[PDB]
Design a protein around this motif. Structure first.
Motif, mmCIF file in Angstrom:
data_model
loop_
_atom_site.group_PDB
_atom_site.id
_atom_site.type_symbol
_atom_site.label_atom_id
_atom_site.label_comp_id
_atom_site.label_asym_id
_atom_site.label_seq_id
_atom_site.Cartn_x
_atom_site.Cartn_y
_atom_site.Cartn_z
ATOM 1 N N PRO A 186 0.812 -1.232 0.000
ATOM 2 C CA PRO A 186 0.000 0.000 0.000
ATOM 3 C C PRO A 186 0.846 1.283 0.000
ATOM 4 O O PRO A 186 0.356 2.326 -0.433
ATOM 5 N N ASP A 187 2.115 1.208 0.452
ATOM 6 C CA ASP A 187 3.017 2.367 0.464
ATOM 7 C C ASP A 187 3.805 2.531 -0.851
ATOM 8 O O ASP A 187 4.574 3.485 -0.988
ATOM 9 N N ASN A 188 3.583 1.619 -1.825
ATOM 10 C CA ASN A 188 4.225 1.662 -3.142
ATOM 11 C C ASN A 188 3.466 2.643 -4.033
ATOM 12 O O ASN A 188 2.663 2.222 -4.867
ATOM 13 N N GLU A 189 3.740 3.949 -3.864
ATOM 14 C CA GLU A 189 3.100 5.041 -4.603
ATOM 15 C C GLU A 189 3.049 4.817 -6.129
ATOM 16 O O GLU A 189 1.965 4.915 -6.716
ATOM 17 N N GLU A 190 4.207 4.481 -6.749
ATOM 18 C CA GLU A 190 4.332 4.243 -8.194
ATOM 19 C C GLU A 190 3.493 3.058 -8.685
ATOM 20 O O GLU A 190 2.728 3.227 -9.638
ATOM 21 N N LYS B 268 -3.914 1.337 -10.715
ATOM 22 C CA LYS B 268 -5.127 2.123 -10.975
ATOM 23 C C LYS B 268 -5.307 2.329 -12.494
ATOM 24 O O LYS B 268 -6.410 2.117 -13.010
ATOM 25 N N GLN B 269 -4.213 2.706 -13.200
ATOM 26 C CA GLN B 269 -4.179 2.913 -14.650
ATOM 27 C C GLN B 269 -4.612 1.641 -15.388
ATOM 28 O O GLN B 269 -5.410 1.728 -16.320
#
Ligand SMILES: O=c1[nH]cnc2c1c(-c1ccc(Br)cc1)cn2-c1ccccc1
Ligand SMILES: O=c1[nH]cnc2c1c(-c1ccc(Br)cc1)cn2-c1ccccc1
Ligand SMILES: O=P(O)(O)OC[C@H]1O[C@](O)(CO)[C@@H](O)[C@@H]1O
Ligand SMILES: O=P(O)(O)OC[C@H]1O[C@](O)(CO)[C@@H](O)[C@@H]1O
Lengths: 442, 442
Positions: free
Chosen positions: A86-90, A96-97
């Motif tokens: 969940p902390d993997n921003e990228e 999501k894309q």
């Protein structure tokens, strides 16, 4: 007034269409987005694939959109569960894309490709993701039906990882132990944000099914239509218990020897030899319990009689009705009905014999057979060439176009073993000669 | 070896039974006790009656055992809710005796009368009562399936009291207001001891369905077999929304004029007049929405064409298949096939035409039609004499024996209005002459 014409292929009475000088087409009910819900290793892909296989077979165009496959396409190599953090921003942006790209393809499938059902195969574990899918459905005039798989049994989770997860393209360079360990960590990444469906308060207005403990229990909320009701019935009839499906035709009959279609002829001397060979084969399989199903036609009943096992006759298993062409040879069909012969050769699935049936009619007739085959465990179905092709197309996920040409030889048992996301098929020829009734396309 | 004979009536291939000098019969799967659960005015009797009507029609012998009817038989006149008081020691003994007497009749029905399903229609609101029913089922080798109806909507409760409770033989000497007030007090007598089904902890191992808020939601637990799965599917498809079912035959056809059976002939001049008369009738009904269903035979499609409404063709609605007797008059059947003619006259329901169908086959074919009719609201079904008799037998709760003789004249609409515990039937003749195709028994 009331002038109708019978369509040459399907034999459907339609209003005589005397199109005006400038013929106008009104080109081309609401499509459905089936939303899979649940933690990884909950059989969502299993449900997606099986349901799609059944819906397509009954004639409802259905397609699966798996978000993980969009991810494998966007991201070259899979390294570890760290991608799912969940902390993997990228990776969260990428994921999501991928979901949005799958939804884009859902819109194109349902609104532009003649698709009726899109199965959105993802975790969709958060209310936020589901609200976004609902917004997408409402804005595109698509219905939304949620299928959640809930299971907290560690034996079931471990079994799923071992059966179909460790063999995933993500774990190509990993051994069974590494892949299992990484997948458990991967599941843990989703557990904190997981908000199960709540039909009691939050999801009260949503159309949903909660499949609890591998189909032991179900929570069904607001079934809107025919297709959702059918899906619910299907999910309630299928199971994951180990079993075998044996499919074969009756032993060679007298009509087979004469090259005649249909009729209700009895077993030839070779057909009777197959029936005895089938009994020996069945005995050698050493099955705890076995259900035997036949058609109401003599040749399948005589074959079952040789087994000395209880059997059940189904009128739904009777061979395709050839109408006016019944008891005729294919040569006699070509000479007496040349237009009919050519029409069938051109469109074998949809072609309906005069006062008879099409492969399309067979599917409708065989729907209850399939539903009962799903409910059962070890079953032997003694049937006919066209019936067998239909049943086989269901189990082997073959299209309507392929179905009338599937090879189903006489005196040959098709042993079906459910494994991973389908059926393993073994062919067992029982070493008894017969004529060949298979005819390839032209 | 493998010698079979075709049974004269049903046309079923059976092993040639050369019974020995002393013929032995092995006289005669496990029966089911369906347990209704819930407070009064929850539609338990409605569910019991409707489910029994459907199960009997599909060929599963089913009977309702209503404990209240055993009570009305044991206790001469009903005075008030005071009879249902938990502190009424005497009436509590009587009520228990009535339940035990109903169970005694359940045992006799399932073990000695060839019954397959017994619907135990009572409150069965306490775990104690249900444990006793389970003990009764286990000791008699009967399966137990629970159907609980949960509804706390006061509008639904009041509507049920007004529709079918105030008109009960218990409230003969009462006016609508007295009966409603007494019934509310009667419900309150059961509320304190009511223990709903708990599939989560206590009733985890029980096979059950919880019908919540008049079929808005369902809790399904441990469906064991085919029949329970069918019941669940049925309950999920039925509704209590107001609607009308119109049933009629196609307008008179050319075969009707010649006294010929089957075929695919077109409308006669009178048939076309009926079709126009039907359009006027449909228009005069002023229905918000109306679904129109036809068979795939020309005469029903031509009739629907006159309506200028969208319609759907069902192959399942096609007239009974007369096999070798198709397009023949009854006189030609008696002269060419006298044995066949006499066999049919003697056993009209089970008789199967050679290479054709029986009324029994029609029921199997029409099962999906009935399930869809249940799901829908306003529907007009344009069909054929034998098909219409089958559908009508379902709606009017007519036996297999009565079914082939139901009067379904040409140019006559049968208007079905669901009310209380069945259908109100209105006949509307559209004032267009036709031949008579009805033939009474001999
Ligand atoms: O509920 C599950 N949890 C984990 N795994 C599961 C399931 C189901 C499943 C779910 C609902 C129904 Br109705 C039938 C099967 C199938 N599988 C599965 C079995 C074998 C291989 C791959 C997946
Ligand atoms: O749940 C109820 N609560 C009170 N009344 C009810 C029902 C149902 C009902 C229940 C389950 C299903 Br699936 C369909 C209908 C029918 N009735 C009813 C309607 C009209 C007259 C008499 C009774
Ligand atoms: O669709 P096809 O290739 O004609 O196969 C079905 C036919 O084959 C047969 O099973 C025998 O060859 C017939 O009973 C039936 O009409
Ligand atoms: O069962 P019965 O009385 O012969 O009625 C069914 C027959 O009636 C007809 O609808 C016409 O009289 C035929 O198409 C069909 O064979």
């Amino acid at each position: 007034p009331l002038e109708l014409t019978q369509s040459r292929v399907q034999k459907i009475w339609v209003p005589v269409d005397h199109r005006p000088s400038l013929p106008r087409s009104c080109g081309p009910n609401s499509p459905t987005v089936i939303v899979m819900v649940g933690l990884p290793a909950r059989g969502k892909t299993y449900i997606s694939k099986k349901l799609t296989r059944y819906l397509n077979w009954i004639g409802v165009p259905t397609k699966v959109f798996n978000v993980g496959e969009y991810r494998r396409e966007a991201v070259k190599q899979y390294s570890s569960y760290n991608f799912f953090r969940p902390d993997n921003e990228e990776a969260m942006k990428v994921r999501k894309q991928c979901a949005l790209a799958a939804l884009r393809d859902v819109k194109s499938y349902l609104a532009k490709e003649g698709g009726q059902i899109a199965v959105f195969d993802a975790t969709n574990t958060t209310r936020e993701r589901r609200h976004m899918i609902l917004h997408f459905a409402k804005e595109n005039d698509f219905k939304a039906f949620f299928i959640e798989s809930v299971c907290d049994d560690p034996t079931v989770v471990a079994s799923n990882i071992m059966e179909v997860k460790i063999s995933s393209p993500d774990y190509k360079d990993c051994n069974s132990a590494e892949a299992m360990d990484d997948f458990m960590k991967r599941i843990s990444c989703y557990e904190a944000s997981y908000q199960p469906l709540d039909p009691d308060k939050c999801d009260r207005d949503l159309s949903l099914i909660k499949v609890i403990d591998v189909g032991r229990r179900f929570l069904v909320n607001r079934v809107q239509d025919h297709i959702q009701s059918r899906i619910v019935y299907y999910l309630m009839n299928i199971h994951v218990q180990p079993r075998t499906i044996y499919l074969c035709r009756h032993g060679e009959n007298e009509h087979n020897l004469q090259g005649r279609i249909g009729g209700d002829s009895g077993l030839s001397s070779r057909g009777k030899k197959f029936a005895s060979a089938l009994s020996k084969f069945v005995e050698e399989q050493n099955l705890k319990d076995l259900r035997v199903w036949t058609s109401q036609l003599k040749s399948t009943i005589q074959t079952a009689e040789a087994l000395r096992l209880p059997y059940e006759q189904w009128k739904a298993l009777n061979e395709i009705d050839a109408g006016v062409c019944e008891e005729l040879t294919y040569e006699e069909i070509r000479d007496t009905y040349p237009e009919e012969y050519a029409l069938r050769e051109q469109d074998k699935y949809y072609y309906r014999y005069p006062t008879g049936e099409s492969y399309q009619d067979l599917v409708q007739r065989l729907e209850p057979v399939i539903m009962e085959l799903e409910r059962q465990e070890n079953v032997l179905v003694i049937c006919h060439q066209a019936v067998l092709r239909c049943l086989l197309a269901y189990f082997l996920d073959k299209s309507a176009e392929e179905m009338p040409y599937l090879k189903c030889p006489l005196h040959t048992v098709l042993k079906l073993t459910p494994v991973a996301y389908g059926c393993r098929v073994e062919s067992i020829y029982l070493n008894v000669e017969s004529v060949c009734t298979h005819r390839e396309r032209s």
